[PDB]
Write a protein that binds this ligand. Structure first.
Ligand code: POV
Ligand code: POV
Ligand code: POV
Ligand code: POV
Ligand code: POV
Ligand code: 6ZP
Ligand code: 2J9
Ligand code: 2J9
Ligand code: 2J9
Ligand code: 2J9
Ligand code: NAG
Ligand code: NA
Ligand code: NA
Ligand code: NA
Lengths: 420, 420, 420, 420
C-alpha cells in the first residue's frame, strides 16, 4: 500500500522541479523536505504518494465553528497518513494531531540590512584618535603655551636686545608674549613651524619636548588612519532585540496574524512588552502581511523584520545585503505530522533520531540552505577618499574663516577706538 | 498511586536545599527539574515522590551482556515511572524507553577562556623602534651636534659678519655655540626647525646628512606603527570550530568516553575529522575525565574544552573569565523519560507544550541559569587610540615641563650671581 | 607478421606531416607516439604498420548492451595489436585489455588566463583622494588666500613698522600682497614654510585653521595610500583548487561527459564536492563540449577550465596569455594498450623502462611540448615603486619648470617696459 | 593459505606500532603501506603474514657475483609472495621480478631551508622605491637647482636690495648662488626647509612644483614602507634546479650511491651535467651518506639536498624550516613487488586501479603524510625595527661626517691660500 503524504510548497522544503520532459508524476517536487521523505521510506517500509493540500494553508481554527484549515484537517480526517512539511509543533495542533519528534529547530529572529560603510559621516577623519585624545591635545596646547609664557618671563636669557643696529641701544624686548606663545604651540602642533624659536635653555626644553609630543601624535594619527582605511571593520546599530527595543529610528515588523506576531502578544517579558507596545500602536506601518513583502521593506527602508529563524538562514544566503541581528527569541520545531493515534508517530520518531546520528539531517540542510556563495568579504580593494569620507575639514575651514572676519571686524573697531 | 520519579543529581538541575532542620522527605530537593516536576504535577494532577537513582548514571549498554544501567534501567524495569532529569533524547535510548517531547535544546559548543586584554604600559609609544635604536638616535644627536660645534668653529666660512646694518666692522661671530649646535640637532630631528641654518659647505654636509637620517627614522616610526595597528586590527579571536581546526597552540578537549567525543568518532565532516584526529592521535593530555576537570584546564592552560551547551551557559555565566566561542555543533534535547508504551508520554508532551506557549520554560531557565550579576559589562570596543594606548606621551610631556621650571630657577640664580 | 597499431589523431601525439608528395604509407604520420613507436620498434625488433582507428574514440561501454568502442574495441577483438596513443590507464579498461607500464603521467589541473598587469597611467599618484577632493583643495587655496589678502589689508595690527633699524618713521607696510597671500596658502599646504607669518590675531586664525586643514589632507593622503599599497600586496591570484572553491566571480569548466567531470561525480573530498555542486546545479554555461571550446572560453571570459595536465602544458606553452594554476588534482597515466593476455605487455614494459633510464622519454616530450620560444621572460617581481607606478610626478615636475621659464621671460619683458 | 608479505621499515610506510600491551603478533606494524595491504586483502582474497627482510635492503646486484640483496632476493627465491614496500619500479629490477602498476608516483626534488627574513640587510630601508626612482630623485635635485640658478639670474624681481638700513644704498645682491640653489633643492627634499625662499613668480613656480614633487615622493616612501612592514613577502634565492645549477654559494647534495645520485651520473641534459660536474669534483663535501644525515646538513648549513619527492613531502610537514624548491626532476613509481611470473601481478594491478577510482590512495596518503599542522604563516605580529632592518643610515651618516671633515680641511686650506 502507498501512503498519502500531504505537503505544502515553500522553498527550500518543497519546490517544483522546473526541469524539461513533461508528463511528470510524483517527480514534480524536490527540496529538503522531499529528500527527508525518501530517507524515511528507505529506513522505514512504505511508498509515498505526494498529494498537496488543496487549501494552501498549514492549519488553524476559524474561532467560530472550530474547523481546521489545511494539512491538519487532512490529518484529522485521515485523508493523509503523514504531513511531512514545515509544520511547527505547537500546543493547539498537538491536542488534535500527533507530531513526531523534531527534525529541525528554529525560533524568532531578526532580519536587518548588513552594515555598508558608504556613508561614514561628513566627519570621521577624526576617528583614529579617541575624543579624549583630541581634547587632551587641545588642553596641552593651552598648557604648554602658558608654561612658555610664564617661563620666558623669568628667564633672563630670553630677554634679548632688539635693534642690533645701535650696539648700545639699551632696550630689552621679549618676543614671547601671550599671543605669540599660543602661536608657537599651535604652530609646532600643525607641523608648520612659526617664526618664533626659543633662545634660552629653559624655553628650548619646553619647545623641544612639545616637538617630540607632536611627532608621536601625528605619527599615531597617520598610522591608525592607515589601519582604519586598510581593514574596514563596520558594525550595526542594533546587535540584539533589546538593543532594538530602544531604537525608534529602526522600526520593527512581523507577518500580520502569524506565529511570530502571536508570540509578542502573549509575551510577559519586559522587552517583548515594549516591542508589542510599538507594533500594536503603529499598526499598518510596521506590521507587513507577507514574509516576502517584509523582506522588501527591510531592503527599501530602515526596518528590522521579525520572522522565523530557518527563513533568515535561507534568505540571507541568497541576498548579501541581508543579515541576522540576534540569536533566537522563541524556540519551536518542525515535526512530521501524523494522524491522531497512528502507528507511524513512533516509527518516524526513531527514524529521525537515526538520520541525526548518522549526520544526514545536517548534510541535507547544508545542501538546500547553503545555496549561492554570498561572497564573504575580503580585505577589499580600497577606493579613493572622498567628500563622504574626509568631508568635514571643509566645514571647519569655512567655520574658521567666518571666525576670522568676526575678529577682523573686532580688530578694526578696537584700534580705531583707542586711536581716538 | 503516587508516581515514583527517577532523578540524577546535577546542577542547575536536581540539588539539595541547604538547611539545618532534618525533617526531610520530598522537600529536600530543588532545581530546574524540580520546578518542572512541580509544574507538570499542577496541570496534570498527579502526586509524586522523588527517588534519586542509586546507580548514579544516566543510561547505556554495559556491553558485557547488553544490560542497561542508571535511569533508563529503572524505567525499563518499571521500577519508577518518570525520569525528570537531563536525559538526552538519543537513538539507543528511544528504542528501550519512550521520551516526552523536549523541554530544553542543547548542542556541542566550545569553552574558551575569555580573551584577556593587553596591558600596554606607560611607554607604549616607544615600541615601533627597538630599544637599541632609541639609544643610538640619542647618541647620534650628541654625536652630530658635537661635530657641528667643532666644524663650525673651525670652518672659516661660518665666521661671517653678523652686523650688516650696524656699520661694517671686524666683529665676526658664529651662530653655532654648544647650546645652539644641540638645538640644530634636536630641532632638525623633530621635523620642526631651529632658528639656525648652516652657511658653510662643511656644515651643510653635516646638516644635509642629519636631515636624511631624520626622514628615515620618522618614516620608519610611522610605517612600523601602521604595521602594528593594522596587524592588531586584522587579528580576531576564534569564533568557530573551523578556527580551532587551523590553530595549533590552542589544544582541544572532551570528556573521555562521553557523548561529546562519540559525536566526533561517527562524524564525517572534514572539519570535524581534523578535530577528532587531533585527539585521536593525542590522548592522556587532552581527553580529560570530567566536566569539572575540563573547566580547570581552560582556566589555567590554553585548553578549549568541548562540553554540552547547557553546561557552558551555566559555567560561563558564573565564572566570567570564561566564554563560549562559536555556535552549536550537534543538536540534542532533554526529554522526560517514561517507560516503553506508557499513558504519560502523551499527557506530558501536551503538558510541556503548554508551558512553552505560556513562557514558563523560559522563566524557569532564566531563574537557574542567570545566577550572579557577574559584571558582564566589558565594553569591548576599541581601535581608537586612547589614554591606555598613547598616554605616556602626556607623562613625558608633563615631566618635560617640570624639568624646565627647575632650569628656569637655575637661569634666574645664575644671572643674579653674575649681576651681584 | 608485422604488428598493426591502433592509433587516434591528437596533438602533440599522432598527426599528419604536411607536404605535397602523395606517395604515403606508414610515413605520413608524426608526433610523440610515432617517435615512441619508432623507438619501441628499434630495441624490440618488430616492424609495424600504423592504422588510425576508424571509430575515432578512445574506449568506453556504450551502455546499450555493454559493447566497447574506439581503440579498446579494436584491441579486444584482436584486430590490431598495439594502441600507442593517449589511452589512459583506468580501472574499466584494465579488465578488458592489458596496458603497458606508463610512458607519461598526467592529472587534472586548471587552465586560467594569465593575470594581466594593471596599467596605472601617468597621473596615478593622484588616486588616494577622489577627484572632487583635489578640486576642493585647490579652491580652498584660492579661497583662504583671498581671505588673507582681505583681512590682512583690513586688520590694523598687520600694519606694522617695517623698518625698526632704518630710523623710526610712519612708513607702515604689510607683507601680505596678493602674490604673497597665495604663497602662504601654497607654502603652508606643502608642509614647507613661506617666508611670511601672520602677526595679527585675525590673520592667525586664518593661518591656524589652514594649518589644521593641511594636516588632515596630508595624513589622509599618506594613510589611504598605505591602505592601497597594503591591500595590493595582500591580494594574490588563485593557485589552488581550494581557491576556486571560495571565489564566485570566476566560473569553472569541464568537458561534458568526460574523464574530468567523472572524477568530480565520484569524489568525496568536500573541497571537490563544492566544485562539483557549482557545476551540478549550473550547466549549459560552464560544462563546455570540447577542449578547443574550453580554451576559447578562458581566452575571452573569466572561465577556469579543468582539463588533463598534458594538454595544458601544450596549450600554456603555445598561447602565453594562459597559465596553469595549482598542481595536479587526479593522477593518471598513459599506457601502450595491448590485448588481454599478450606477450607484448611485458616486452614493452621493460622497453618503456629502458627509455626512461636513458632519458629518452624526457627528450621526446621536450621536443613536442616546448614548441615556440613564446617569450616566457615576464619579470613578475614588484612592490618597489617604479617609473610605471609613480612616474607622473616627474611629468608634473617637468611641466612646472617649462611653465616657469615662460614666466621668467614674462618678468624680463615687464621690467624692461617699465625701464624704457 | 596465508601469503608471505616481505616488507622494510621506513616512515610513514611501515613503522613499529609503539603502543603498550606486548606479545604482539603481526600487529606490530602500521602506516600507509600497511593500510594499503589490508585494502588489498579486502578487495582480493588472501591473508598476509608480514615477514620483514632479514637484510634491511631493498635490492640490487653486487656487480661481482650477480646476486640480489634484500626483498628482490626474497622475491626471486619465492620466499615471499608480495613485496608491498617503497620498492621503486626500475629497469634492472623488472627484468628479474614483476611489479604491479604504481600506487604512488615520485621523482627527484630539492630540499632547502624556507626563507626567513631575519637578516634583510643592513640597508633595505631603501627597498620601497626602486633604484631607478632613488636615482631619478637624485638627478631631479641637480636638475631643479640648476634651473633655479639659471632662472633666478634673468628674473629681475629676484635681484632685490640688501642693506634696507640705508634706503638708497644702491647695491643689488641675489642670494640664489649656485651653492644656495642646491641647498634649496636638498633642503626642500628632506622636509626641513632652508633659509632661502623665492621672491619672484618665476622662481616661486620652480620652488612650488619641487615642493609638490617632494610630498608625493615622501608620502610614497612612507606608504610603501608601511606595505612592506605589514605584509612580509619573502623569497628564496633558488626556485628551480637550473637556478641552483648556477649558485656556487649554495652547495648541492645526494645520498652516496643512491637512486638519486645515479640519475645525475647517467644524465645527458645540460643542466644535470653541470650539477654532476659539481658533486663529482666536490665529493666528500656535498655527497652525504644518509638521507637523515642530509636533512641535518640542510639545517646546519647553506645546502640544497637532492632526494626523493615523497620524503620531501613527509619531511617538510614535520619541520617548518624546510621546503621544496622545485617540481620533479626524475619520474619513478612505487610498485607492489610480485615474484617472476606470478598470478598476483594482474590482481594487485586491477586492485590498485580500483582503490584509485574510489579515492582511497589519496585519503591514505593525506592521513600519513599530512602529519603535524606546520602552522602556515599569517600576517604575523610585527616586531620592533632594529639594526638588522634600518641599520645602514648609521653608515651613510658616518660616511657623511667623514666627507665633511675632508671638506672642512679643504675650506681651511683654500681660504688661507687666497688670504696670503
Ligand atoms: C574669494 C572669497 C571666497 C571665500 C569662500 C571660500 C573660502 C573657504 C572655502 C571653503 C569650501 C570651498 C570648497 C568647495 C565647496 C565645498 C563643498 C563641500 O565639500 O560640502 C561639504 C560641506 O562643506 C561646506 O562648504 C559647508 C559650508 C559651511 C557652512 C557652515 C558655516 C557657515 C559659513 C558659510 C560661508 C563660509 C565661507 C565664506 C568665508 C568668507 C559637505 O558636502 P555634503 O553635502 O555633505 O556631501 C554629501 C556627503 N555624503 C555623500 C555622505 C552624503
Ligand atoms: C592631526 C593631529 C594633530 C592636530 C590636533 C588639533 C586639535 C583639535 C582637533 C580636533 C578637536 C575635535 C574634538 C571632537 C572629537 C569628536 C567629536 C565629534 O565627532 O562631534 C562633532 C565634531 O567635532 C568638531 O567638528 C570639532 C572641529 C575640530 C576643529 C578644531 C580646529 C583646530 C585648529 C587649531 C587648534 C589648535 C589649538 C587651538 C587653541 C588655540 C560633530 O561630528 P559628528 O556629528 O559626530 O559626525 C558624525 C560622524 N561620526 C559619527 C563618525 C563621528
Ligand atoms: C610644570 C608642571 C607640569 C604639570 C602641568 C603641566 C601643564 C600642562 C601640560 C600637560 C597637561 C595637559 C594634558 C592634560 C592632562 C595630562 C595627563 C593626562 O592626560 O591624564 C590622563 C592619562 O595620563 C596619565 O596616565 C596620568 C598619570 C599621572 C602620573 C604623572 C607622573 C609623572 C609626573 C612627572 C613628575 C616630574 C618628573 C621630573 C623629572 C624626573 C588620565 O587618563 P586616565 O583615565 O587616568 O588613564 C589611566 C590609564 N590606564 C587606563 C591604563 C589605567
Ligand atoms: C625619503 C624619500 C626622499 C629622499 C630621497 C634622497 C635621495 C637619495 C637617497 C638615496 C639614493 C640611494 C641609491 C641606491 C639605490 C639602491 C642601491 C643599493 O641598494 O646598493 C647599496 C646602497 O647604496 C647606498 O648606500 C647609497 C646611500 C644613499 C645616501 C644618500 C645621502 C643623501 C644626502 C642628501 C641627498 C640629496 C641630493 C644630493 C645632491 C646634492 C648597497 O646596499 P646593499 O649592499 O645592496 O644592501 C643589502 C640589502 N639589500 C640587498 C636588501 C638591498
Ligand atoms: C625647463 C625644461 C624642462 C625639462 C628639463 C628640466 C630639468 C630637470 C627636471 C626634470 C628632469 C629630471 C628627472 C629625470 C628625467 C625626467 C623624466 C623621466 O624620469 O623619464 C622616465 C619616466 O618619465 C616619463 O614617463 C618620460 C615621458 C616624457 C614625456 C614628457 C611630456 C610632457 C612634457 C611637458 C612639456 C611642457 C608643458 C607646458 C605646459 C602645458 C622615463 O622612464 P621610462 O622607462 O620611459 O618609463 C616608461 C613608462 N611606462 C613603463 C609605463 C611605459
Ligand atoms: N597602540 C599603539 C601605539 C601608539 C603610538 C605609538 C606606539 C604604539 C604601539 C606600537 C607597537 C608596535 C610593536 C611592534 C611593531 C610596531 N608597533 C606596540 N604597542 C603596544 C601595544 C600594547 C602593548 C604593548 C605595546 C604600541 O602601543
Ligand atoms: O515544541 S517542542 O517539540 N517542545 C517545546 N520546545 C522547547 C523547550 C524549548 C522545543 C524546542 C525545540 C524543538 F525542535 C521542539 C520543541
Ligand atoms: O532528539 S530530537 O527530538 N530529534 C532530533 N533533533 C534534531 C534535528 C536536529 C532534535 C533537536 C532538538 C531537540 F530538542 C530534540 C531533537
Ligand atoms: O594507472 S596507474 O598505473 N595506477 C594508479 N596510479 C596512481 C596514483 C597512484 C598511476 C599514477 C601515474 C601513472 F602514470 C599511472 C598510474
Ligand atoms: O617506472 S614507470 O612504471 N614507467 C616509467 N615512468 C615514466 C614515463 C615517466 C613512470 C612514471 C610514474 C610512475 F608511477 C611509474 C613509472
Ligand atoms: C577572573 O580572574 C581571577 C584570577 O585571574 C579569578 O580567580 C576570578 O574568578 C575572576 N575575577 C573576577 C571575577 O573578579
Ligand atoms: Na513507542
Ligand atoms: Na597599512
Ligand atoms: Na618481468
Amino acid at each position: 500500500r502507498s501512503l498519502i503524504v500531504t505537503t505544502i510548497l515553500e522553498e527550500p522544503y518543497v519546490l517544483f522541479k522546473k526541469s524539461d520532459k513533461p508528463l511528470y508524476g510524483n517527480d514534480r517536487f524536490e527540496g529538503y523536505c522531499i529528500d527527508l521523505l525518501r530517507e524515511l521510506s528507505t529506513i522505514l517500509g512504505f511508498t509515498y504518494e505526494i498529494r498537496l493540500v488543496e487549501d494552501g494553508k498549514y492549519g488553524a481554527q476559524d474561532d467560530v465553528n472550530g474547523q481546521w484549515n489545511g494539512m491538519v484537517r487532512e490529518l484529522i480526517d485521515h485523508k493523509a497518513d503523514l504531513a511531512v512539511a514545515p509544520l511547527a509543533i505547537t500546543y493547539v495542533r498537538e491536542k488534535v494531531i500527533d507530531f513526531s519528534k523534531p527534525f529541525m529547530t528554529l525560533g524568532i529572529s531578526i532580519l536587518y540590512r548588513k552594515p555598508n560603510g558608504t556613508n561614514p559621516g561628513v566627519f570621521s577623519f577624526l576617528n583614529p584618535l579617541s575624543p579624549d585624545i583630541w581634547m587632551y591635545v587641545l588642553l596641552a596646547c593651552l598648557g604648554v603655551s602658558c608654561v612658555l609664557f610664564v617661563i620666558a618671563r623669568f628667564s633672563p636669557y630670553e630677554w634679548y636686545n632688539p635693534h642690533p643696529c645701535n650696539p648700545d641701544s639699551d632696550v630689552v624686548e621679549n618676543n614671547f608674549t601671550l599671543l605669540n606663545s599660543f602661536w608657537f604651540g599651535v604652530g609646532a602642533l600643525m607641523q608648520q613651524g612659526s617664526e618664533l624659536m626659543p633662545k634660552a635653555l629653559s624655553t628650548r626644553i619646553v619647545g623641544g619636548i612639545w616637538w617630540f609630543f607632536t611627532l608621536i601624535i601625528i605619527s599615531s594619527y597617520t598610522a591608525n588612519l592607515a589601519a582604519f582605511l586598510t581593514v574596514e571593520r563596520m558594525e550595526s546599530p542594533i546587535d540584539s532585540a533589546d538593543d532594538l527595543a530602544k531604537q525608534t529610528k529602526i522600526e520593527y515588523g512581523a507577518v500580520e496574524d502569524g506565529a511570530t506576531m502571536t508570540f509578542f502578544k502573549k509575551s510577559k517579558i519586559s522587552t517583548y512588552d515594549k516591542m508589542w507596545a510599538f507594533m500594536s500602536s503603529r499598526r499598518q506601518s510596521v506590521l507587513v502581511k507577507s514574509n516576502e513583502e517584509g523582506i522588501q521593506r527591510v531592503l527599501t527602508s530602515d526596518y528590522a523584520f521579525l520572522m522565523e529563524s530557518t527563513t533568515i538562514e535561507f534568505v540571507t544566503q541568497r541576498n548579501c545585503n541581508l543579515t541576522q541581528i540576534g540569536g533566537l527569541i522563541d524556540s519551536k520545531g518542525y515535526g512530521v505530522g501524523t494522524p491522531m493515534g497512528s502507528p507511524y508517530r513512533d516509527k518516524i520518531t526513531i527514524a529521525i533520531l537515526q538520520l541525526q546520528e548518522e549526520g544526514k539531517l545536517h548534510m541535507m540542510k547544508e545542501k538546500w540552505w547553503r545555496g549561492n556563495g554570498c561572497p564573504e568579504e575580503e580585505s577589499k580593494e580600497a577606493s579613493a577618499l572622498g567628500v563622504q569620507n574626509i568631508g568635514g575639514i571643509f566645514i571647519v575651514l569655512a567655520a574658521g574663516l567666518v571666525l576670522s572676519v568676526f575678529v577682523a571686524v573686532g580688530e578694526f573697531l578696537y584700534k580705531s577706538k583707542k586711536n581716538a
